[PDB]
Amino acid sequence: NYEELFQTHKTPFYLYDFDKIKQAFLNYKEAFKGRKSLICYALKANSNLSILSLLAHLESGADCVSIGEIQRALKAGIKPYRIVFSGVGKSAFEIEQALKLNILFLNVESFMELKTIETIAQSLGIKARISIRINPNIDAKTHPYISTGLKENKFGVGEKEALEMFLWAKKSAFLEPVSVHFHIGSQLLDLEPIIEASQKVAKIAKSLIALGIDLRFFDVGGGIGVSYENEETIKLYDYAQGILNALQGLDLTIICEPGRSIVAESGELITQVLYEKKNKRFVIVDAGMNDFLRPSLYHAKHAIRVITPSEISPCDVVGPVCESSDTFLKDAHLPELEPGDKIAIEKVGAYGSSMASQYNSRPKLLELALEDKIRVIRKREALEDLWRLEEEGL
Amino acid sequence: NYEELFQTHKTPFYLYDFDKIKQAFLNYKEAFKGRKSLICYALKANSNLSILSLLAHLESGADCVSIGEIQRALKAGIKPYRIVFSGVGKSAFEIEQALKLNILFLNVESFMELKTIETIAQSLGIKARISIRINPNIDAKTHPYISTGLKENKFGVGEKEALEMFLWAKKSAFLEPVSVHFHIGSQLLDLEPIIEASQKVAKIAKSLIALGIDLRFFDVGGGIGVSYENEETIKLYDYAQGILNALQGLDLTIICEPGRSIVAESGELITQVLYEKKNKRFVIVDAGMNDFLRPSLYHAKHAIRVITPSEISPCDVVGPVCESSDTFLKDAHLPELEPGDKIAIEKVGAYGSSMASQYNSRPKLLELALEDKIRVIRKREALEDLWRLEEEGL
Numbered sequence A, B: 001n002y003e004e005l006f007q008t009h010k011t012p013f014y015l016y017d018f019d020k021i022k023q024a025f026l027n028y029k030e031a032f033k034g035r036k037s038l039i040c041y042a043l044k045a046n047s048n049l050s051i052l053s054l055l056a057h058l059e060s061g062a063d064c065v066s067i068g069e070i071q072r073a074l075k076a077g078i079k080p081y082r083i084v085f086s087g088v089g090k091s092a093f094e095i096e097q098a099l100k101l102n103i104l105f106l107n108v109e110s111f112m113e114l115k116t117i118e119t120i121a122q123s124l125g126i127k128a129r130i131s132i133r134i135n136p137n138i139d140a141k142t143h144p145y146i147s148t149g150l151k152e153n154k155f156g157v158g159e160k161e162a163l164e165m166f167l168w169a170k171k172s173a174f175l176e177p178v179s180v181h182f183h184i185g186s187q188l189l190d191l192e193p194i195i196e197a198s199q200k201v202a203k204i205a206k207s208l209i210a211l212g213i214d215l216r217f218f219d220v221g222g223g224i225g226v227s228y229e230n231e232e233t234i235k236l237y238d239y240a241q242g243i244l245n246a247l248q249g250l251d252l253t254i255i256c257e258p259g260r261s262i263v264a265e266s267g268e269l270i271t272q273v274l275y276e277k278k279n280k281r282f283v284i285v286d287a288g289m290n291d292f293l294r295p296s297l298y299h300a301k302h303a304i305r306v307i308t309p310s311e312i313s314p315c316d317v318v319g320p321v322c323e324s325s326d327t328f329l330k331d332a333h334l335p336e337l338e339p340g341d342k343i344a345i346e347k348v349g350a351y352g353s354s355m356a357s358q359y360n361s362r363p364k365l366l367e368l369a370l371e372d373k374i375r376v377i378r379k380r381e382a383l384e385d386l387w388r389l390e391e392e393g394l
């Protein structure tokens, strides 16, 4: 139905097949039937109000890392008691606001954060439910930038320190430790590191309960990778089976914070061809690194599919921005295209538009959704929106 | 005067010493007195309306890469005849709009772009002034992402193809080739590659004039690096001397498109300390990769200076965003700091806030300027501005 679409909407834009979002979520929801579980969608992947609303209708939870994400989630209909707040840098304002919104719990990453939360909870006269993120010091075997389970990283804390922090939250009248948490990385293709982390944390948890800490949740975070380059993906059946075995003897509600695996595939970046240039061939498209940062930031390769029915040769698919990092795919293989032909960059639903900028003074793109029905879920930015907040200073 | 400042403004924010911008510009303006020259500030570095206005009062020009940047420049007071438009991906809309705004010239990067411009100029009944960017196939010796002078890159075209394109623009009644241009890279510390490029392009230019092409400008682009890590910088006296010698026998107006070297130093990212965390020490600050992308994108190291008068040890300075790439400086050395202490990340005036995003749902920062006088040049974004264009879809 691309024809009606290209007639009423100009490129480049993000297009989301919502069914894939609803099905991916439903798979996590059912992968855990033999137990009580909560699937907290990691907003950082994609926080569009419309998609969050779709997830809310499915009674989804939300893994937030800022007051901004918590506000989005609540505004989209997600129940506060299904909202978890992570973050190594939550500010007093964010802490206070979260406590007043009655979310599930604050996942603390430092002892100083725990003391900060206590002071704020105390002034508000409430007992703050908290979870503690531990760094099981395990290599997730992914890209260094999205690998977070090693001791080298700023996320979570070691076992000894965690044990101390927990005891501390127990004694406090303004803290209530109710959960253990861990997240070793993103875009993970190997299930061993995850399982190893589950066992180690299940051990510390068992230890925690013996010390009086009343745990009610076991949070494994997110991290399951998608098939960007046709690689084999960690099956949910094996994932769940692994975590259930790692939790032997622990009657706790399992929590998953999937992000990428929920929205990646449903989103695609539709962009039009502007020029073809020639030893090497360059296919200049109207979308750029400001719209899609993954390739340059992580050297990520997303598939490129021609949408317009039209001699296949090697070519670099590039955008309009003035930098060399602005090329979507090096040595790609496509048929000769002409000005106006449309192509789609695949699996850009996660960390796609959420990391997008206005670099080179390019307005943020139009975002469309398909619900079987094409509707706008984010209007395109006007040129004037780029400098709206700079006008008074002029 | 940091005290009055921290009393009326909350962190994190960008602070610009405008004098440094005015002096850096004046240095380029005078580095070429023995010749006619035009300094076209590359907006991509920093397009804030206030700074562009300051540059306009100094009769500065503008190197733009989008209609958005051209509009900003014009709105800030830059004369259209001092505006040059580069870009490998200009769309028909941008081309048409530029031609109607009477800018200096369009710097074309492909033969198909040249034909596209011709068709549009023809329909508007005007003779479009154009410049042609050539790829002198020279390694600028910088970071691959900002290195653009190799044949491997999508910028410019080889000599043979350029010669053909020029002849083509000469014959056309809707094109008027008036300039040759080249830009081999950014953050360049070695003056040899630049000079080598100047000589080669000066040769092709001399050749062009012999073929009837009436050249009036010689554009060397930008690219001069700054001292991020106390390295030696290419002096302007040597830069100018080199280009003048490379231009022997060519009476042309020299054009420079400096960006970084104009604004880098004048801007600083003031951020407050939230927590300290401990084998390794982590200094958690309230600014993040969404606000300053350079470290993660280019592995760039900007100096970190403590602003608050307050045992120096090794520590990773990190932001609040959920990613490992979100650390400003690895193994930095700073005194023990406490919640509330202020620090400034140096030389972030270029490609700082212009590549900033709202990732993790964090509003764009407040930008302040000093004019000896502290005034806001960009109001901070409200939480609601993050999802303003998503509300109707909800």
Ligand SMILES: Cc1ncc(COP(=O)(O)O)c(C[NH2+]CCCC[C@H](N)C(=O)O)c1O
Pocket: A042, A044, A045, A063, A086, A146, A183, A185, A186, A187, A221, A222, A223, A224, A257, A258, A259, A260, A261, A294, A298, A350, A351, B322, B323
């Ligand atoms: C605490 C916590 N929970 C869940 C996730 C979401 O993981 P995922 O999307 O299911 O893999 C995270 C992950 N945080 C960082 C993800 C960085 C990805 C990067 N921007 C990219 O690949 O583009 C988390 O921290």
Ligand SMILES: Cc1ncc(COP(=O)(O)O)c(C[NH2+]CCCC[C@H](N)C(=O)O)c1O
Pocket: A322, A323, B042, B044, B045, B063, B086, B146, B183, B185, B186, B187, B221, B222, B223, B224, B257, B258, B259, B260, B261, B294, B298, B350, B351
């Ligand atoms: C055509 C053209 N003219 C001038 C410049 C500006 O160069 P500079 O700031 O004086 O070095 C450019 C450069 N374009 C790409 C710069 C990328 C820098 C990167 N975002 C970073 O270092 O953060 C140009 O293309």
